[PDB]
Amino acid sequence: PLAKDKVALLIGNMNYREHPKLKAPLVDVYELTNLLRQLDFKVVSLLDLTEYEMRNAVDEFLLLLDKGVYGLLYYAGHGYENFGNSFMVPVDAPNPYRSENCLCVQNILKLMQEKETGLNVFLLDMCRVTANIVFGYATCEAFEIQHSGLANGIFMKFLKDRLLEDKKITVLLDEVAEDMGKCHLTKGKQALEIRSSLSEKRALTDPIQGTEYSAESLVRNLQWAKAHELPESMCLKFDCGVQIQLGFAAEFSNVMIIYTSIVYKPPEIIMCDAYVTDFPLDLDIDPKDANKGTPEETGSYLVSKDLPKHCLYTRLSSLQKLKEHLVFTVCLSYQYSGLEDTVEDKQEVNVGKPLIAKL
Ligand SMILES: CCc1cccc(CC)c1NS(=O)(=O)c1ccc(-c2cc(C(=O)O)co2)cc1C
């Protein structure tokens, strides 16, 4: 069995405006992204999407599902069930739940049934002609804290240990269901429901068609690369002599970490700090969560010890809301040894449209 292409969309909703916040989707989406990339999937990973953002991302993923393509859609977050229908709850959903503000799972499944995909795996990890659809519906908020301090969901804990196996995906999911049935938290409970219309031996490990005769995979690699460009590191020189470096890192397709570091501080300056401020209003960055001494303090625990020491960190987690160039100010507060007060100096910076903001 061959795949025309391998495309995946992973959505993790945590920071809910009107519902309890979740912790596991952060690590789960991150770890599943790296695992799927190892299996040659072009992965788009998105955190904290609103109703209109979720609908657009799912529609765009559905658009990639041409004949023979392998697709994987994973959603982790709040879910709701109402009279035979299940719904994915976006972060801007009002309380109480209502269908028009949520994404109907049955409507997605119905649109997936119309595709001629080689394999379509739709996995929900919710806090409650064949299309070859394999649907996994986990209803575990329960999670486990690792030796690292990161929260791993019950479904993903077992899934990550078996996802790289060269076995038929339905057989793989049935092993994960057995693992959860042995787990004390989910032992005698209906924690995972698998529905499958898979008539042939398809696996996530199946190779992609050769590029000599099938160039669809190359186009999608170019489009994935285009939507995943990080700004290059930049050095700003200030009038007092201080030089600041602005660094960039990616956590998810819509989550970027910005850090500032002091490259040079003249001897005359006793203490200086470079802060990033005045970001575009659509980004919704609360200044009390920016310019932290560690990446963890910003909510960034993946790509945390992989950033230089003695920097200030800022997490931009809503890049899908950016409709213009990312223009912000680098503020430098500095003190001379024998001076009365702190001196302020501001410099504007344009880093274009990073990651999915490019689209
Ligand atoms: C081929 C690479 C790929 C693999 C898997 C899945 C996709 C589509 C999701 C894509 N295409 S992409 O060009 O990288 C892409 C990435 C993100 C978004 C998006 C829209 C919103 C929003 O409207 O809020 C947020 O993100 C839209 C696209 C077209």
Side-chain angles (χ1 to χ4, degrees):
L2 296 183
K4 178 90 188 173
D5 200 8
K6 293 163 106 183
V7 294
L9 174 61
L10 271 46
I11 301 177
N13 281 349
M14 287 161 59
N15 303 115
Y16 281 81
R17 177 192 301 175
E18 299 232 306
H19 295 92
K21 299 191 163 176
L22 302 158
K23 304 221 124 159
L26 184 78
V27 184
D28 292 353
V29 166
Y30 192 86
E31 291 185 326
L32 179 59
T33 301
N34 298 335
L35 250 57
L36 291 176
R37 283 185 183 154
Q38 286 190 60
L39 301 176
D40 299 294
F41 274 82
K42 290 132 200 71
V43 184
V44 164
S45 55
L46 299 167
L47 286 197
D48 294 326
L49 301 186
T50 67
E51 182 208 332
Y52 285 150
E53 290 164 6
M54 277 188 82
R55 297 196 193 282
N56 185 68
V58 172
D59 288 339
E60 226 72 46
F61 163 80
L62 258 20
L63 234 31
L64 305 162
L65 308 181
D66 290 324
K67 180 128 197 305
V69 165
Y70 278 31
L72 190 149
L73 174 60
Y74 172 83
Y75 169 73
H78 283 302
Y80 105 93
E81 273 187 39
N82 189 58
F83 294 125
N85 303 99
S86 317
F87 300 89
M88 290 150 57
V89 181
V91 301
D92 69 329
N95 188 56
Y97 296 138
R98 45 212 98 165
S99 73
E100 77 267 19
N101 291 276
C102 306
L103 276 73
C104 183
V105 166
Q106 339 297 133
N107 287 344
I108 294 167
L109 277 177
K110 181 144 187 167
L111 289 172
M112 285 174 166
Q113 282 165 30
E114 299 166 6
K115 307 287 179 180
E116 291 168 293
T117 44
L119 184 57
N120 205 3
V121 179
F122 185 12
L123 305 174
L124 295 173
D125 202 359
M126 306 201 298
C127 183
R128 207 203 281 189
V129 157
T130 185
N132 285 158
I133 298 161
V134 177
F135 175 70
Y137 181 32
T139 46
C140 306
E141 180 204 15
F143 61 83
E144 297 179 19
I145 290 297
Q146 283 175 116
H147 341 98
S148 46
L150 296 156
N152 226 356
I154 312 305
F155 179 56
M156 186 60 60
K157 181 198 180 176
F158 300 113
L159 193 57
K160 77 186 205 174
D161 291 353
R162 305 201 173 268
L163 210 79
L164 305 157
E165 296 173 7
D166 181 41
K167 281 177 182 167
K168 186 177 186 176
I169 188 57
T170 53
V171 181
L172 206 140
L173 265 2
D174 183 86
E175 281 162 10
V176 171
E178 247 190 272
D179 283 334
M180 280 185 282
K182 280 174 270 164
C183 168
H184 304 306
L185 275 139
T186 49
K187 192 199 164 191
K189 315 287 188 172
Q190 298 180 7
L192 186 69
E193 188 201 4
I194 306 157
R195 302 174 155 129
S196 168
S197 57
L198 189 57
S199 55
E200 46 210 37
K201 194 174 186 293
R202 308 309 259 234
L204 294 180
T205 51
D206 292 349
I208 290 165
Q209 281 174 192
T211 53
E212 292 179 29
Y213 62 79
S214 178
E216 202 195 82
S217 198
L218 303 164
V219 167
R220 307 235 178 104
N221 276 144
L222 261 32
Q223 297 167 168
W224 187 85
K226 180 174 207 166
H228 287 263
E229 291 157 344
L230 224 31
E232 277 274 320
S233 207
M234 57 205 294
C235 280
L236 311 153
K237 305 175 174 179
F238 280 89
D239 280 15
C240 62
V242 169
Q243 186 175 347
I244 301 307
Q245 195 192 43
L246 254 177
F248 307 92
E251 219 184 322
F252 301 89
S253 304
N254 63 329
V255 181
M256 174 180 68
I257 299 111
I258 298 171
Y259 59 88
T260 56
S261 166
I262 293 153
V263 174
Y264 179 73
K265 175 194 74 53
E268 61 257 17
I269 298 171
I270 195 97
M271 181 150 69
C272 67
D273 269 273
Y275 299 96
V276 295
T277 198
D278 302 320
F279 285 94
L281 296 157
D282 291 330
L283 286 189
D284 189 25
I285 278 100
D286 196 305
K288 262 206 150 191
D289 307 321
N291 297 294
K292 297 292 189 211
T294 66
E296 294 90 1
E297 284 172 83
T298 76
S300 180
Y301 315 93
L302 326 126
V303 185
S304 72
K305 246 68 197 301
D306 308 295
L307 306 158
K309 305 285 164 296
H310 316 306
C311 299
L312 290 184
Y313 306 82
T314 300
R315 190 169 193 259
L316 313 197
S317 51
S318 49
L319 286 179
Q320 78 279 3
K321 299 177 161 56
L322 201 63
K323 289 182 166 189
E324 64 206 296
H325 291 326
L326 185 53
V327 175
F328 62 91
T329 299
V330 179
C331 190
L332 177 76
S333 307
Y334 59 100
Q335 307 192 25
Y336 281 100
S337 309
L339 215 54
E340 329 116 329
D341 221 283
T342 64
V343 195
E344 272 205 26
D345 196 7
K346 295 172 64 155
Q347 189 152 321
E348 156 170 297
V349 158
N350 188 318
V351 303
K353 300 180 169 189
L355 304 173
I356 62 162
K358 183 68 126 29
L359 316 165

PDB file of all heavy atoms in Angstrom, residues 7-9 42-44 46 49 52-54 56-58 60-61 64 220-221 223-224 227-228 253 320 356 359, ligand 1:
ATOM      1  N   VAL A   7      -0.852  14.058   5.051  1.00  0.00           N
ATOM      2  CA  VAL A   7      -1.146  15.372   5.628  1.00  0.00           C
ATOM      3  C   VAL A   7      -1.878  15.233   6.956  1.00  0.00           C
ATOM      4  O   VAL A   7      -2.727  14.358   7.094  1.00  0.00           O
ATOM      5  CB  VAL A   7      -1.909  16.298   4.642  1.00  0.00           C
ATOM      6  CG1 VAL A   7      -1.034  16.667   3.443  1.00  0.00           C
ATOM      7  CG2 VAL A   7      -3.229  15.677   4.179  1.00  0.00           C
ATOM      8  N   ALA A   8      -1.527  16.058   7.946  1.00  0.00           N
ATOM      9  CA  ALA A   8      -2.170  15.985   9.254  1.00  0.00           C
ATOM     10  C   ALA A   8      -2.457  17.350   9.838  1.00  0.00           C
ATOM     11  O   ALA A   8      -1.680  18.273   9.640  1.00  0.00           O
ATOM     12  CB  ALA A   8      -1.324  15.175  10.221  1.00  0.00           C
ATOM     13  N   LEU A   9      -3.580  17.475  10.552  1.00  0.00           N
ATOM     14  CA  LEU A   9      -4.000  18.696  11.231  1.00  0.00           C
ATOM     15  C   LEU A   9      -4.292  18.294  12.653  1.00  0.00           C
ATOM     16  O   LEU A   9      -5.119  17.423  12.889  1.00  0.00           O
ATOM     17  CB  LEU A   9      -5.274  19.286  10.616  1.00  0.00           C
ATOM     18  CG  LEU A   9      -5.873  20.479  11.356  1.00  0.00           C
ATOM     19  CD1 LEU A   9      -4.883  21.657  11.406  1.00  0.00           C
ATOM     20  CD2 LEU A   9      -7.180  20.882  10.746  1.00  0.00           C
ATOM     21  N   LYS A  42       3.014  15.827   6.636  1.00  0.00           N
ATOM     22  CA  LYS A  42       3.189  17.264   6.660  1.00  0.00           C
ATOM     23  C   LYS A  42       2.171  17.670   7.724  1.00  0.00           C
ATOM     24  O   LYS A  42       0.974  17.482   7.534  1.00  0.00           O
ATOM     25  CB  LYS A  42       2.891  17.901   5.294  1.00  0.00           C
ATOM     26  CG  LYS A  42       3.940  17.577   4.231  1.00  0.00           C
ATOM     27  CD  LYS A  42       3.296  17.108   2.936  1.00  0.00           C
ATOM     28  CE  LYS A  42       4.228  16.337   2.035  1.00  0.00           C
ATOM     29  NZ  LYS A  42       4.547  14.984   2.568  1.00  0.00           N
ATOM     30  N   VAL A  43       2.649  18.100   8.894  1.00  0.00           N
ATOM     31  CA  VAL A  43       1.785  18.395  10.031  1.00  0.00           C
ATOM     32  C   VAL A  43       1.590  19.871  10.299  1.00  0.00           C
ATOM     33  O   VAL A  43       2.558  20.623  10.355  1.00  0.00           O
ATOM     34  CB  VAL A  43       2.339  17.701  11.302  1.00  0.00           C
ATOM     35  CG1 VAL A  43       1.415  17.898  12.488  1.00  0.00           C
ATOM     36  CG2 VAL A  43       2.585  16.216  11.065  1.00  0.00           C
ATOM     37  N   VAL A  44       0.336  20.272  10.526  1.00  0.00           N
ATOM     38  CA  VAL A  44      -0.016  21.615  10.956  1.00  0.00           C
ATOM     39  C   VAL A  44      -0.573  21.431  12.360  1.00  0.00           C
ATOM     40  O   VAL A  44      -1.501  20.647  12.552  1.00  0.00           O
ATOM     41  CB  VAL A  44      -1.015  22.319  10.016  1.00  0.00           C
ATOM     42  CG1 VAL A  44      -1.649  23.532  10.696  1.00  0.00           C
ATOM     43  CG2 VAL A  44      -0.324  22.729   8.725  1.00  0.00           C
ATOM     44  N   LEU A  46      -2.053  23.395  15.742  1.00  0.00           N
ATOM     45  CA  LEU A  46      -2.618  24.673  16.148  1.00  0.00           C
ATOM     46  C   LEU A  46      -3.175  24.595  17.554  1.00  0.00           C
ATOM     47  O   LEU A  46      -3.860  23.638  17.911  1.00  0.00           O
ATOM     48  CB  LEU A  46      -3.732  25.085  15.168  1.00  0.00           C
ATOM     49  CG  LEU A  46      -3.326  25.292  13.702  1.00  0.00           C
ATOM     50  CD1 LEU A  46      -4.545  25.366  12.809  1.00  0.00           C
ATOM     51  CD2 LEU A  46      -2.456  26.551  13.527  1.00  0.00           C
ATOM     52  N   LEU A  49      -7.933  27.541  19.162  1.00  0.00           N
ATOM     53  CA  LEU A  49      -8.645  28.131  18.034  1.00  0.00           C
ATOM     54  C   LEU A  49     -10.083  28.513  18.369  1.00  0.00           C
ATOM     55  O   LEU A  49     -10.770  27.791  19.084  1.00  0.00           O
ATOM     56  CB  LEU A  49      -8.652  27.169  16.838  1.00  0.00           C
ATOM     57  CG  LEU A  49      -7.326  26.698  16.261  1.00  0.00           C
ATOM     58  CD1 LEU A  49      -7.567  25.893  15.041  1.00  0.00           C
ATOM     59  CD2 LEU A  49      -6.408  27.874  15.914  1.00  0.00           C
ATOM     60  N   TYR A  52     -14.566  30.277  14.217  1.00  0.00           N
ATOM     61  CA  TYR A  52     -14.244  30.559  12.818  1.00  0.00           C
ATOM     62  C   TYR A  52     -12.858  30.083  12.409  1.00  0.00           C
ATOM     63  O   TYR A  52     -12.703  29.611  11.291  1.00  0.00           O
ATOM     64  CB  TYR A  52     -14.478  32.026  12.477  1.00  0.00           C
ATOM     65  CG  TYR A  52     -15.955  32.357  12.342  1.00  0.00           C
ATOM     66  CD1 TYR A  52     -16.437  33.627  12.638  1.00  0.00           C
ATOM     67  CD2 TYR A  52     -16.867  31.404  11.896  1.00  0.00           C
ATOM     68  CE1 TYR A  52     -17.787  33.933  12.517  1.00  0.00           C
ATOM     69  CE2 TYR A  52     -18.213  31.702  11.759  1.00  0.00           C
ATOM     70  CZ  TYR A  52     -18.673  32.966  12.069  1.00  0.00           C
ATOM     71  OH  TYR A  52     -20.012  33.257  11.918  1.00  0.00           O
ATOM     72  N   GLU A  53     -11.891  30.090  13.327  1.00  0.00           N
ATOM     73  CA  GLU A  53     -10.546  29.587  13.056  1.00  0.00           C
ATOM     74  C   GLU A  53     -10.556  28.067  12.900  1.00  0.00           C
ATOM     75  O   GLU A  53      -9.916  27.552  11.989  1.00  0.00           O
ATOM     76  CB  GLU A  53      -9.601  29.996  14.178  1.00  0.00           C
ATOM     77  CG  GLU A  53      -9.315  31.479  14.175  1.00  0.00           C
ATOM     78  CD  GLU A  53      -8.714  32.010  15.459  1.00  0.00           C
ATOM     79  OE1 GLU A  53      -8.394  31.199  16.359  1.00  0.00           O
ATOM     80  OE2 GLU A  53      -8.560  33.249  15.565  1.00  0.00           O
ATOM     81  N   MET A  54     -11.308  27.359  13.769  1.00  0.00           N
ATOM     82  CA  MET A  54     -11.449  25.910  13.715  1.00  0.00           C
ATOM     83  C   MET A  54     -12.106  25.481  12.426  1.00  0.00           C
ATOM     84  O   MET A  54     -11.593  24.603  11.757  1.00  0.00           O
ATOM     85  CB  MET A  54     -12.257  25.379  14.906  1.00  0.00           C
ATOM     86  CG  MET A  54     -11.444  25.197  16.132  1.00  0.00           C
ATOM     87  SD  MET A  54     -12.323  24.359  17.451  1.00  0.00           S
ATOM     88  CE  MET A  54     -12.113  22.687  16.947  1.00  0.00           C
ATOM     89  N   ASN A  56     -12.289  27.073   9.543  1.00  0.00           N
ATOM     90  CA  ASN A  56     -11.421  27.304   8.398  1.00  0.00           C
ATOM     91  C   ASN A  56     -10.292  26.299   8.323  1.00  0.00           C
ATOM     92  O   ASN A  56     -10.001  25.824   7.239  1.00  0.00           O
ATOM     93  CB  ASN A  56     -10.868  28.728   8.342  1.00  0.00           C
ATOM     94  CG  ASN A  56     -10.070  28.955   7.064  1.00  0.00           C
ATOM     95  OD1 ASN A  56     -10.618  28.978   5.952  1.00  0.00           O
ATOM     96  ND2 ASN A  56      -8.759  29.053   7.181  1.00  0.00           N
ATOM     97  N   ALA A  57      -9.648  25.985   9.449  1.00  0.00           N
ATOM     98  CA  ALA A  57      -8.559  25.021   9.479  1.00  0.00           C
ATOM     99  C   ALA A  57      -9.037  23.626   9.043  1.00  0.00           C
ATOM    100  O   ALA A  57      -8.370  22.989   8.232  1.00  0.00           O
ATOM    101  CB  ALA A  57      -7.945  24.972  10.864  1.00  0.00           C
ATOM    102  N   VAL A  58     -10.204  23.170   9.540  1.00  0.00           N
ATOM    103  CA  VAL A  58     -10.760  21.874   9.150  1.00  0.00           C
ATOM    104  C   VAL A  58     -11.140  21.853   7.646  1.00  0.00           C
ATOM    105  O   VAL A  58     -10.810  20.903   6.951  1.00  0.00           O
ATOM    106  CB  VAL A  58     -11.918  21.421  10.080  1.00  0.00           C
ATOM    107  CG1 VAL A  58     -12.603  20.173   9.547  1.00  0.00           C
ATOM    108  CG2 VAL A  58     -11.418  21.181  11.492  1.00  0.00           C
ATOM    109  N   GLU A  60      -9.755  23.646   5.224  1.00  0.00           N
ATOM    110  CA  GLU A  60      -8.503  23.663   4.484  1.00  0.00           C
ATOM    111  C   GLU A  60      -7.823  22.290   4.492  1.00  0.00           C
ATOM    112  O   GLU A  60      -7.160  21.942   3.523  1.00  0.00           O
ATOM    113  CB  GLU A  60      -7.567  24.725   5.088  1.00  0.00           C
ATOM    114  CG  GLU A  60      -6.893  25.605   4.061  1.00  0.00           C
ATOM    115  CD  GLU A  60      -7.804  26.601   3.387  1.00  0.00           C
ATOM    116  OE1 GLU A  60      -8.584  27.266   4.102  1.00  0.00           O
ATOM    117  OE2 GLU A  60      -7.738  26.723   2.143  1.00  0.00           O
ATOM    118  N   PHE A  61      -7.955  21.534   5.596  1.00  0.00           N
ATOM    119  CA  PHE A  61      -7.393  20.194   5.721  1.00  0.00           C
ATOM    120  C   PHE A  61      -8.190  19.244   4.818  1.00  0.00           C
ATOM    121  O   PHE A  61      -7.600  18.432   4.104  1.00  0.00           O
ATOM    122  CB  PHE A  61      -7.438  19.720   7.181  1.00  0.00           C
ATOM    123  CG  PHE A  61      -7.256  18.227   7.355  1.00  0.00           C
ATOM    124  CD1 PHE A  61      -5.994  17.655   7.319  1.00  0.00           C
ATOM    125  CD2 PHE A  61      -8.356  17.389   7.504  1.00  0.00           C
ATOM    126  CE1 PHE A  61      -5.838  16.280   7.439  1.00  0.00           C
ATOM    127  CE2 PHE A  61      -8.193  16.017   7.607  1.00  0.00           C
ATOM    128  CZ  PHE A  61      -6.938  15.475   7.592  1.00  0.00           C
ATOM    129  N   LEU A  64      -7.261  19.097   1.124  1.00  0.00           N
ATOM    130  CA  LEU A  64      -6.070  18.330   0.757  1.00  0.00           C
ATOM    131  C   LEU A  64      -6.355  16.851   0.483  1.00  0.00           C
ATOM    132  O   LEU A  64      -5.483  16.162  -0.033  1.00  0.00           O
ATOM    133  CB  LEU A  64      -5.057  18.398   1.906  1.00  0.00           C
ATOM    134  CG  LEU A  64      -4.645  19.781   2.371  1.00  0.00           C
ATOM    135  CD1 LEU A  64      -4.027  19.711   3.726  1.00  0.00           C
ATOM    136  CD2 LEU A  64      -3.676  20.412   1.396  1.00  0.00           C
ATOM    137  N   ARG A 220       3.052  19.956  -1.753  1.00  0.00           N
ATOM    138  CA  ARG A 220       2.599  20.089  -0.375  1.00  0.00           C
ATOM    139  C   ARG A 220       3.745  20.323   0.585  1.00  0.00           C
ATOM    140  O   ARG A 220       3.555  21.046   1.551  1.00  0.00           O
ATOM    141  CB  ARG A 220       1.712  18.925   0.035  1.00  0.00           C
ATOM    142  CG  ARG A 220       0.570  18.744  -0.974  1.00  0.00           C
ATOM    143  CD  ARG A 220      -0.775  18.760  -0.315  1.00  0.00           C
ATOM    144  NE  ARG A 220      -1.868  18.636  -1.274  1.00  0.00           N
ATOM    145  CZ  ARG A 220      -2.569  17.528  -1.477  1.00  0.00           C
ATOM    146  NH1 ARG A 220      -2.249  16.407  -0.843  1.00  0.00           N
ATOM    147  NH2 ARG A 220      -3.572  17.524  -2.345  1.00  0.00           N
ATOM    148  N   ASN A 221       4.953  19.821   0.289  1.00  0.00           N
ATOM    149  CA  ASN A 221       6.147  20.114   1.090  1.00  0.00           C
ATOM    150  C   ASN A 221       6.542  21.592   0.939  1.00  0.00           C
ATOM    151  O   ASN A 221       7.014  22.199   1.893  1.00  0.00           O
ATOM    152  CB  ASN A 221       7.324  19.266   0.616  1.00  0.00           C
ATOM    153  CG  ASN A 221       7.398  17.884   1.180  1.00  0.00           C
ATOM    154  OD1 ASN A 221       7.804  16.942   0.489  1.00  0.00           O
ATOM    155  ND2 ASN A 221       7.047  17.727   2.454  1.00  0.00           N
ATOM    156  N   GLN A 223       4.416  24.062   0.148  1.00  0.00           N
ATOM    157  CA  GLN A 223       3.365  24.830   0.825  1.00  0.00           C
ATOM    158  C   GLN A 223       3.512  24.747   2.345  1.00  0.00           C
ATOM    159  O   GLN A 223       3.283  25.744   3.018  1.00  0.00           O
ATOM    160  CB  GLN A 223       1.958  24.393   0.362  1.00  0.00           C
ATOM    161  CG  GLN A 223       1.733  24.664  -1.138  1.00  0.00           C
ATOM    162  CD  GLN A 223       0.513  24.004  -1.758  1.00  0.00           C
ATOM    163  OE1 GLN A 223       0.128  24.332  -2.889  1.00  0.00           O
ATOM    164  NE2 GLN A 223      -0.126  23.061  -1.052  1.00  0.00           N
ATOM    165  N   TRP A 224       3.935  23.584   2.888  1.00  0.00           N
ATOM    166  CA  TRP A 224       4.174  23.441   4.324  1.00  0.00           C
ATOM    167  C   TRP A 224       5.374  24.307   4.706  1.00  0.00           C
ATOM    168  O   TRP A 224       5.318  25.002   5.710  1.00  0.00           O
ATOM    169  CB  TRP A 224       4.447  21.977   4.740  1.00  0.00           C
ATOM    170  CG  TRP A 224       4.533  21.816   6.229  1.00  0.00           C
ATOM    171  CD1 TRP A 224       3.493  21.632   7.091  1.00  0.00           C
ATOM    172  CD2 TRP A 224       5.708  21.971   7.043  1.00  0.00           C
ATOM    173  NE1 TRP A 224       3.947  21.640   8.387  1.00  0.00           N
ATOM    174  CE2 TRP A 224       5.304  21.849   8.385  1.00  0.00           C
ATOM    175  CE3 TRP A 224       7.056  22.250   6.770  1.00  0.00           C
ATOM    176  CZ2 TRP A 224       6.200  22.006   9.449  1.00  0.00           C
ATOM    177  CZ3 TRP A 224       7.946  22.360   7.822  1.00  0.00           C
ATOM    178  CH2 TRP A 224       7.518  22.231   9.141  1.00  0.00           C
ATOM    179  N   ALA A 227       4.386  28.109   4.842  1.00  0.00           N
ATOM    180  CA  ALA A 227       3.611  28.421   6.050  1.00  0.00           C
ATOM    181  C   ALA A 227       4.362  28.195   7.362  1.00  0.00           C
ATOM    182  O   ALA A 227       3.764  28.377   8.421  1.00  0.00           O
ATOM    183  CB  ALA A 227       2.346  27.589   6.068  1.00  0.00           C
ATOM    184  N   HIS A 228       5.640  27.777   7.314  1.00  0.00           N
ATOM    185  CA  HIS A 228       6.378  27.502   8.542  1.00  0.00           C
ATOM    186  C   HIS A 228       7.712  28.235   8.621  1.00  0.00           C
ATOM    187  O   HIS A 228       8.625  27.780   9.292  1.00  0.00           O
ATOM    188  CB  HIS A 228       6.516  25.986   8.744  1.00  0.00           C
ATOM    189  CG  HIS A 228       5.215  25.374   9.156  1.00  0.00           C
ATOM    190  ND1 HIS A 228       4.932  25.121  10.485  1.00  0.00           N
ATOM    191  CD2 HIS A 228       4.105  25.113   8.417  1.00  0.00           C
ATOM    192  CE1 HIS A 228       3.692  24.658  10.502  1.00  0.00           C
ATOM    193  NE2 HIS A 228       3.151  24.641   9.283  1.00  0.00           N
ATOM    194  N   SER A 253       2.383  25.582  14.855  1.00  0.00           N
ATOM    195  CA  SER A 253       2.196  26.343  13.625  1.00  0.00           C
ATOM    196  C   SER A 253       1.742  27.780  13.894  1.00  0.00           C
ATOM    197  O   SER A 253       2.086  28.679  13.126  1.00  0.00           O
ATOM    198  CB  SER A 253       1.224  25.626  12.695  1.00  0.00           C
ATOM    199  OG  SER A 253       1.691  24.310  12.445  1.00  0.00           O
ATOM    200  N   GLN A 320      -2.519  33.044  14.128  1.00  0.00           N
ATOM    201  CA  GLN A 320      -3.604  32.930  13.151  1.00  0.00           C
ATOM    202  C   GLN A 320      -4.496  34.204  13.129  1.00  0.00           C
ATOM    203  O   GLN A 320      -5.253  34.414  12.188  1.00  0.00           O
ATOM    204  CB  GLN A 320      -4.442  31.667  13.425  1.00  0.00           C
ATOM    205  CG  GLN A 320      -5.447  31.769  14.581  1.00  0.00           C
ATOM    206  CD  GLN A 320      -4.848  31.570  15.953  1.00  0.00           C
ATOM    207  OE1 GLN A 320      -3.648  31.406  16.120  1.00  0.00           O
ATOM    208  NE2 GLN A 320      -5.670  31.582  16.980  1.00  0.00           N
ATOM    209  N   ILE A 356       2.168  30.619  10.120  1.00  0.00           N
ATOM    210  CA  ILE A 356       0.917  30.611   9.378  1.00  0.00           C
ATOM    211  C   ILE A 356       0.397  32.001   9.050  1.00  0.00           C
ATOM    212  O   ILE A 356      -0.503  32.092   8.224  1.00  0.00           O
ATOM    213  CB  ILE A 356      -0.168  29.748  10.041  1.00  0.00           C
ATOM    214  CG1 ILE A 356      -0.543  30.274  11.435  1.00  0.00           C
ATOM    215  CG2 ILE A 356       0.245  28.267  10.055  1.00  0.00           C
ATOM    216  CD1 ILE A 356      -1.803  29.757  11.877  1.00  0.00           C
ATOM    217  N   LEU A 359       0.212  33.075   5.217  1.00  0.00           N
ATOM    218  CA  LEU A 359      -0.907  32.669   4.352  1.00  0.00           C
ATOM    219  C   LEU A 359      -1.956  33.753   4.145  1.00  0.00           C
ATOM    220  O   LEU A 359      -2.461  34.313   5.119  1.00  0.00           O
ATOM    221  CB  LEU A 359      -1.577  31.395   4.895  1.00  0.00           C
ATOM    222  CG  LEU A 359      -0.620  30.299   5.348  1.00  0.00           C
ATOM    223  CD1 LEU A 359      -1.308  29.263   6.179  1.00  0.00           C
ATOM    224  CD2 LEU A 359       0.194  29.768   4.195  1.00  0.00           C
TER     225      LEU A 359
HETATM  226  C1  LIG B   1       0.303  21.190   3.057  1.00  0.00           C
HETATM  227  C2  LIG B   1       0.488  21.642   4.533  1.00  0.00           C
HETATM  228  C3  LIG B   1      -0.761  21.389   5.403  1.00  0.00           C
HETATM  229  C4  LIG B   1      -0.826  20.189   6.127  1.00  0.00           C
HETATM  230  C5  LIG B   1      -1.930  19.894   6.934  1.00  0.00           C
HETATM  231  C6  LIG B   1      -3.000  20.786   6.996  1.00  0.00           C
HETATM  232  C7  LIG B   1      -2.971  21.990   6.270  1.00  0.00           C
HETATM  233  C8  LIG B   1      -4.192  22.923   6.425  1.00  0.00           C
HETATM  234  C9  LIG B   1      -4.506  23.131   7.927  1.00  0.00           C
HETATM  235  C10 LIG B   1      -1.831  22.312   5.482  1.00  0.00           C
HETATM  236  N1  LIG B   1      -1.753  23.548   4.747  1.00  0.00           N
HETATM  237  S1  LIG B   1      -0.908  24.928   5.176  1.00  0.00           S
HETATM  238  O1  LIG B   1      -0.682  25.731   3.981  1.00  0.00           O
HETATM  239  O2  LIG B   1       0.303  24.664   5.937  1.00  0.00           O
HETATM  240  C11 LIG B   1      -2.086  25.751   6.252  1.00  0.00           C
HETATM  241  C12 LIG B   1      -1.724  25.867   7.600  1.00  0.00           C
HETATM  242  C13 LIG B   1      -2.547  26.501   8.530  1.00  0.00           C
HETATM  243  C14 LIG B   1      -3.784  27.022   8.129  1.00  0.00           C
HETATM  244  C15 LIG B   1      -4.663  27.738   9.122  1.00  0.00           C
HETATM  245  C16 LIG B   1      -5.788  28.403   8.869  1.00  0.00           C
HETATM  246  C17 LIG B   1      -6.148  28.928  10.194  1.00  0.00           C
HETATM  247  C18 LIG B   1      -7.270  29.780  10.574  1.00  0.00           C
HETATM  248  O3  LIG B   1      -8.045  30.156   9.718  1.00  0.00           O
HETATM  249  O4  LIG B   1      -7.375  30.165  11.841  1.00  0.00           O
HETATM  250  C19 LIG B   1      -5.178  28.513  10.993  1.00  0.00           C
HETATM  251  O5  LIG B   1      -4.242  27.789  10.387  1.00  0.00           O
HETATM  252  C20 LIG B   1      -4.132  26.958   6.773  1.00  0.00           C
HETATM  253  C21 LIG B   1      -3.307  26.322   5.825  1.00  0.00           C
HETATM  254  C22 LIG B   1      -3.786  26.311   4.368  1.00  0.00           C
END
